[PDB]
Write a protein that holds these residues in place. Structure first.
Motif, PDB file in Angstrom:
ATOM      1  N   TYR A 147      -5.430 -10.913  15.778  1.00 12.65           N
ATOM      2  CA  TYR A 147      -5.978  -9.969  14.821  1.00 12.65           C
ATOM      3  C   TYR A 147      -7.032  -9.167  15.571  1.00 12.65           C
ATOM      4  CZ  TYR A 147      -8.801  -8.044  11.084  1.00 12.65           C
ATOM      5  OH  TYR A 147      -9.501  -7.182  10.303  1.00 12.65           O
ATOM      6  N   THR A 148      -6.901  -7.835  15.526  1.00 14.52           N
ATOM      7  CA  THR A 148      -7.844  -6.950  16.170  1.00 14.52           C
ATOM      8  C   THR A 148      -8.345  -5.954  15.125  1.00 14.52           C
ATOM      9  OG1 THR A 148      -6.695  -7.198  18.257  1.00 14.52           O
ATOM     10  CG2 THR A 148      -8.079  -5.181  17.966  1.00 14.52           C
ATOM     11  N   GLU A 149      -9.656  -5.686  15.160  1.00 13.56           N
ATOM     12  CA  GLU A 149     -10.243  -4.745  14.219  1.00 13.56           C
ATOM     13  C   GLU A 149     -11.173  -3.810  14.976  1.00 13.56           C
ATOM     14  OE1 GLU A 149     -12.034  -6.816  10.815  1.00 13.56           O
ATOM     15  OE2 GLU A 149     -13.823  -5.559  11.158  1.00 13.56           O
ATOM     16  N   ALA A 181     -15.030  -2.945  18.712  1.00 15.20           N
ATOM     17  CA  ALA A 181     -13.838  -3.645  18.259  1.00 15.20           C
ATOM     18  C   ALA A 181     -13.911  -5.119  18.656  1.00 15.20           C
ATOM     19  CB  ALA A 181     -12.592  -2.980  18.797  1.00 15.20           C
ATOM     20  N   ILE A 182     -13.156  -5.931  17.920  1.00 13.83           N
ATOM     21  CA  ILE A 182     -13.033  -7.348  18.154  1.00 13.83           C
ATOM     22  C   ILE A 182     -11.563  -7.736  18.100  1.00 13.83           C
ATOM     23  CG2 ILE A 182     -13.380  -7.943  15.692  1.00 13.83           C
ATOM     24  CD1 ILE A 182     -14.798 -10.456  16.562  1.00 13.83           C
ATOM     25  N   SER A 183     -11.193  -8.685  18.962  1.00 12.75           N
ATOM     26  CA  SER A 183      -9.904  -9.329  18.857  1.00 12.75           C
ATOM     27  C   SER A 183     -10.100 -10.831  18.754  1.00 12.75           C
ATOM     28  CB  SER A 183      -8.987  -8.951  20.010  1.00 12.75           C
ATOM     29  OG  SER A 183      -9.488  -9.448  21.244  1.00 12.75           O
ATOM     30  N   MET A 184      -9.252 -11.451  17.938  1.00 14.96           N
ATOM     31  CA  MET A 184      -9.228 -12.888  17.761  1.00 14.96           C
ATOM     32  C   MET A 184      -7.816 -13.374  18.053  1.00 14.96           C
ATOM     33  SD  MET A 184     -11.704 -13.588  14.531  1.00 14.96           S
ATOM     34  CE  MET A 184     -10.980 -12.332  13.478  1.00 14.96           C
ATOM     35  N   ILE A 212      -5.021  -4.169  13.990  1.00 14.42           N
ATOM     36  CA  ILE A 212      -3.781  -4.429  14.703  1.00 14.42           C
ATOM     37  C   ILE A 212      -3.516  -5.931  14.668  1.00 14.42           C
ATOM     38  CG2 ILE A 212      -2.584  -4.275  16.904  1.00 14.42           C
ATOM     39  CD1 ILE A 212      -4.629  -1.957  17.598  1.00 14.42           C
ATOM     40  N   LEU A 261       0.823  -1.193   0.000  1.00 13.93           N
ATOM     41  CA  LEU A 261       0.000   0.000   0.000  1.00 13.93           C
ATOM     42  C   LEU A 261       0.868   1.259   0.000  1.00 13.93           C
ATOM     43  CD1 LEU A 261      -0.046   1.327   3.041  1.00 13.93           C
ATOM     44  CD2 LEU A 261      -1.305  -0.754   3.574  1.00 13.93           C
ATOM     45  N   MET A 321      -9.281   0.834  12.166  1.00 10.65           N
ATOM     46  CA  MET A 321      -7.951   0.299  11.986  1.00 10.65           C
ATOM     47  C   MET A 321      -7.927  -1.196  12.297  1.00 10.65           C
ATOM     48  SD  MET A 321      -6.055   1.691  15.428  1.00 10.65           S
ATOM     49  CE  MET A 321      -4.447   1.045  14.982  1.00 10.65           C
ATOM     50  N   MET A 355     -16.792  -4.876   9.749  1.00  8.92           N
ATOM     51  CA  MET A 355     -17.027  -5.623  10.983  1.00  8.92           C
ATOM     52  C   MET A 355     -18.067  -6.719  10.739  1.00  8.92           C
ATOM     53  SD  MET A 355     -16.234  -6.115  14.172  1.00  8.92           S
ATOM     54  CE  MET A 355     -15.291  -4.652  14.614  1.00  8.92           C
ATOM     55  N   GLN A 410       0.213  -2.113  13.021  1.00 14.04           N
ATOM     56  CA  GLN A 410      -1.075  -1.580  12.641  1.00 14.04           C
ATOM     57  C   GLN A 410      -1.195  -1.398  11.129  1.00 14.04           C
ATOM     58  OE1 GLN A 410      -1.927   2.647  13.226  1.00 14.04           O
ATOM     59  NE2 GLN A 410       0.116   2.905  14.156  1.00 14.04           N
ATOM     60  N   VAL A 411      -2.448  -1.411  10.663  1.00 19.53           N
ATOM     61  CA  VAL A 411      -2.843  -0.742   9.452  1.00 19.53           C
ATOM     62  C   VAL A 411      -3.439   0.592   9.892  1.00 19.53           C
ATOM     63  CG1 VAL A 411      -4.190  -0.714   7.333  1.00 19.53           C
ATOM     64  CG2 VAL A 411      -3.253  -2.878   8.181  1.00 19.53           C
TER      65      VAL A 411
END
Ligand code: NA
Ligand code: NA
Lengths: 227, 103, 103, 103, 103, 103
Positions: free
Chosen positions: F27-29, E98-101, F39, D31, F37, E68, F49-50
């Protein structure tokens, strides 16, 4: 077709999901080439069962009926309070041991079918629980199982396995039919250890190719379309 | 409103159903100028296109053309059995209008 | 704000819940002009559509219509069990308003 | 209209077919400004790009460039065999015009 | 910029972390007008929404709301373990920020 | 035009390569306003990060930012090995400019 195979195993479903299926000994995850285990059908088939139904030398053994798997289960896992019988789809990672090893099959009454590289979670239909050795007849279905994909597939033909048979370099089998027509370089035909190295490298290549097919089947469903 | 691909197909002139009941054999995709399209084949040799967007398409079809290309790629990769295609058979290769998957 | 599909469905006129608890049997998609739509069936014969976007839809629904078609395609391919559909019963086939998936 | 990648490729100047019949060995995506692109390699060392969008592209190609990057990523992740690439050989690395997948 | 979901969550008023360490039990999606949203549940009964886009959202969030919903659908279908959710607790159900996996 | 991520990264002053050769650990969104963003972390603790799209980005990068978030999500879910990241190191966490994946 929708034929199933069966295997008793003390490893519970949570562990199997984590490991990406039912693994051969020394292999922690299905797709982990990491460092390469020995792959040899002949050695697998002649392995002794202690705490596990045969799972050495790069293959995981199964039976062709629930009844057989259960009986075999009880001779091995009778000390376990709970174990599982996994119900497994047929697919071309499976080799009928008797057909591949022919007259040299070591336990022909066992009628085993063995998965090269183990059995991916997505190939597991479900599992039964066994309590102390006593079968619970409730079939727990595997959510990650893919019915249309696996009901369209069969075990490998024996001819796909003859070259993987893994007989000793100077064994008579390599100069006899059918194996003579499939023998790896160095196996009964013209640096030491060629037969062993080729047998291994042929097994690795088979597994690499087969893994690509599994990845394609599972991972294609993680694709999220854009725009 | 039609309830199946066959009845949908019959609403249009110059269409036919192909019954394949087979997975896609090959998937081809192009970004080359004026050939922004996808082509699929089956093992019997049957060949089908998703047409380059053009003046034969109304605005509402532009998004559907993109969707169809998405569907053919994922059908190809997942080896999903294609039941039927509805195609315009006044184009060469036949141009996909609709797809059904079952079994 | 509703907490489940049943309560959501009850907020609208001319809707009902269908309880399937089954995977999708067939998925059909069309790019033909004025029939840019999807149709699903279940093995019991029940048939449902995602409607062609039109003047019955507000602007906020346009993206959701596209998403629903995405959801049905991937649900079909992954053999995901559909729990319930909320549908408008004044269309034929019944038109999907919402979907729930649970095992 | 071409029915295969070879005939499609022959419609353009400065192109050639590479026959790979192999999975993608590496996938790279950027990017970074003015380098919004993807690069793939095969185990034989062959390296290919999807070009940064620019004045060499017509408007109709913009969506196709995005689709191609999507196709390469999922092909990489699924270890799908790439049959052929049609590329422009007046760029370094060679610039992808089309892809075919079979087997 | 925050390095994890917990620190991110603490930047906002009216939020809390839920630690689930579990797969999603159900996924619901609606295209119905004014209820273009998703709802998820966990086996413990916890219920969460992705809010209908509205005047409480800035323009930069619109694409992230869509993303999301994409993430929750694929997490549901793949049985991916959800580590934490950051949610706004001044909505019912709690609204995902937000979510984390992991794992 | 660069042929690999290392050469690409060297075209910029404020970038560096990290070599991971590992799958993504988490993976966090986020859709929260001003923190739209993603992470990721690796098991060694490395965090990336993005970036939130902003005035440091030219228009051509906006689509590539969205694509990168898509790439990281599917890389995470497929446990694909990340080879290298090219990052801007004037941000904390380091901001991803490019990714390479290879086994
Ligand atoms: Na089978
Ligand atoms: Na020989």
């Amino acid at each position: 077709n929708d034929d199933k195979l069966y295997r008793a195993d003390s490893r519970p479903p949570d562990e199997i999901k984590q490991s990406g299926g039912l693994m051969p000994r020394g292999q922690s995850e299905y797709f982990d080439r990491g460092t390469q285990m020995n792959i040899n059908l002949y050695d697998h088939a002649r392995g002794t069962q202690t705490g596990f139904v045969r799972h050495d030398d790069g293959y995981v053994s199964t039976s062709i009926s629930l009844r057989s798997a259960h009986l075999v289960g009880q001779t091995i896992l009778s000390g376990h309070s709970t174990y599982y019988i996994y119900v497994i789809a047929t697919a071309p990672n499976m080799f009928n041991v008797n057909d591949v090893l022919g007259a040299y099959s070591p336990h022909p009454d066992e009628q085993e079918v063995s998965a090269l590289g183990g059995i991916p979670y997505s190939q597991i239909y479900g599992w039964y629980r066994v309590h102390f050795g006593v079968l619970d007849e409730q079939l727990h279905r595997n959510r990650g199982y893919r019915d249309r994909y696996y009901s369209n597939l069969d075990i490998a033909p024996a001819a796909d396995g003859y070259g993987l048979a893994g007989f000793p370099p100077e064994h008579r089998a390599w100069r006899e039919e059918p194996w003579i027509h499939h023998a790896p370089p160095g196996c009964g035909n013209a640096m030491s250890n060629t037969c062993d190295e080729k047998t291994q490298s042929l097994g690795v290549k088979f597994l690499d190719e087969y893994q690509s097919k599994v990845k394609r089947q599972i991972f294609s469903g993680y694709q999220s379309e854009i725009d | 409103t039609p309830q199946n691909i066959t009845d949908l197909c019959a609403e249009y002139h110059n269409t036919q159903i192909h019954t394949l009941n087979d997975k896609i054999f090959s998937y081809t995709e192009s970004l080359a100028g004026k050939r922004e399209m996808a082509i699929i084949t089956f093992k019997n040799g049957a060949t089908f296109q998703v047409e380059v967007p053009g003046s034969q398409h109304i605005d509402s079809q532009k998004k559907a053309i993109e969707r169809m290309k998405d569907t053919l790629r994922i059908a190809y990769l997942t080896e999903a059995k294609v039941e039927k295609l509805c195609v315009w058979n006044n184009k060469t290769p036949h141009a996909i209008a609709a797809i059904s998957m079952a079994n």
